Structure 1
Amino acid sequence: HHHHHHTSKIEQPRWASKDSAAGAASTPDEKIVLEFMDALTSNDAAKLIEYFAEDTMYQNMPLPPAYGRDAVEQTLAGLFTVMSYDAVETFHIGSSNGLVYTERVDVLRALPTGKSYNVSVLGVFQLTEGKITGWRDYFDLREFEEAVDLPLRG
């Protein structure tokens, strides 16, 4: 067992547009996505999975995709066993053609190690009738792993 380490709080980057609309909802889809982000910090897969279509998809890119609502829940749940969302901060959101884009920092705690880390993520969401048909997050896995002693690949 290891104590919860300090949770370093979130830098507001120099490149963060200070047009305060850039990080604000503008479509019903965008509104949904932002709401979904807020749900992450609940670390509850049953809460999250309701946002998804049956015919959906989910992938942290340095990690294998989950195809199908059933696969996605397993992946989500799997993740929630070694890590936990403390905070999700979306600097920029935007949409087009059914896709929504979020520039974020996620604040995560590796459960086994108790270590915390702030992750630069750019995610894309696909919606269809208010339901997530795809969710893909882009980030660098090695530096999260190293930061919190949690080898996640393989």
Structure 2
Amino acid sequence: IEQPRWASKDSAAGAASTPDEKIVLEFVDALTSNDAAKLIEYFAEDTMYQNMPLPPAYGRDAVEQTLAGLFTVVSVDAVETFHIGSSNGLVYTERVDVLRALPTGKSYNFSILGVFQLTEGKITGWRDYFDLREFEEAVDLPLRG
């Protein structure tokens, strides 16, 4: 999985330079855990998680459940973060997630730009934007949108 032509060293993951950037980098790196119980610890009680524009999860319980549901049908095999940056309390990750369907073994590269909001170092919001065309096939759960 190569570096894109448009990747900029000035915003590379290794150049993350605020507490929030470093926390978010750590979190998306921990996605390969496939471990909802570990991942949920990064979230505030008052929080949200959405794969745009699918129905959002609000509240830590809902986030935990949807993360747990994901890892029953999908392994996040790799996360490759090309850019990380932050502005006005928001953190951006321009990246690629590699998802492998557990029942088919088929692998999928998703180009993602995600925005995170943290409050006192805990995730208050997380919205990933990417193409969902292959998402319905890749995740063996009914899309609810």
Q: Same fold (TM over 0.5)?
A: yes
2: CA distance between counterparts of 1:64 and 1:38?
24
> Kindly tell me: are residues 148 and 60 of structure 1, through their superposed partners in 2, closer, same or farther at Cα, counting changes over 3 Å?
closer
Q: CA deviation at 1:83?
A: 0.8
> Kindly tell me: are residues 146 and 54 of structure 1, through their superposed partners in 2, closer, same or farther at Cα, counting changes over 3 Å?
closer
> Kindly tell me: are residues 62 and 111 of structure 1, through their superposed partners in 2, closer, same or farther at Cα, counting changes over 3 Å?
farther
Give the conservation status (yes or no) of the 8 Å contact 2:100–2:138: no
Give the conservation status (yes or no) of the 8 Å contact 1:41–1:85: yes
1: CA distance between counterparts of 2:3 and 2:48?
30
Q: CA deviation at 1:149?
A: 8.2
TM-score by length of 2: 0.91
- Report the identity percentage: 97
> Kindly tell me: are residues 149 and 78 of structure 1, through their superposed partners in 2, closer, same or farther at Cα, counting changes over 3 Å?
closer
Q: How does 1:1-154 map to 2 (within 5 A)?
A: 10-19=1-10, 21=12, 24-146=15-137, 152=143
> Kindly tell me: are residues 13 and 147 of structure 1, through their superposed partners in 2, closer, same or farther at Cα, counting changes over 3 Å?
farther
Secondary structure of 1:85's partner?
strand
> Kindly tell me: are residues 114 and 130 of structure 1, through their superposed partners in 2, closer, same or farther at Cα, counting changes over 3 Å?
same
2: CA distance between counterparts of 1:77 and 1:149?
13
Q: CA deviation at 1:20?
A: 6.5
Give the conservation status (yes or no) of the 8 Å contact 2:84–2:94: yes
**Higher Cα Rg, which structure:** 1
Higher fraction of helix: 2
1: CA distance between counterparts of 2:79 and 2:12?
18
Greater shift after overlay, 12-21 or 104-113?
12-21
Secondary structure of 1:55's partner?
coil
Q: CA deviation at 1:18?
A: 3.5
Residue correspondences, number: 145
Deviations 1:79-119 (A, max 9, x none): 11111111101100111111000000011101111100111
2: CA distance between counterparts of 1:146 and 1:79?
13
Gaps of 5+ in 1: 1-9
Give the conservation status (yes or no) of the 8 Å contact 1:100–1:125: yes
Give the conservation status (yes or no) of the 8 Å contact 1:62–1:140: no
TM-score by length of 1: 0.86
Give the conservation status (yes or no) of the 8 Å contact 2:95–2:111: yes
Give the conservation status (yes or no) of the 8 Å contact 1:41–1:84: yes
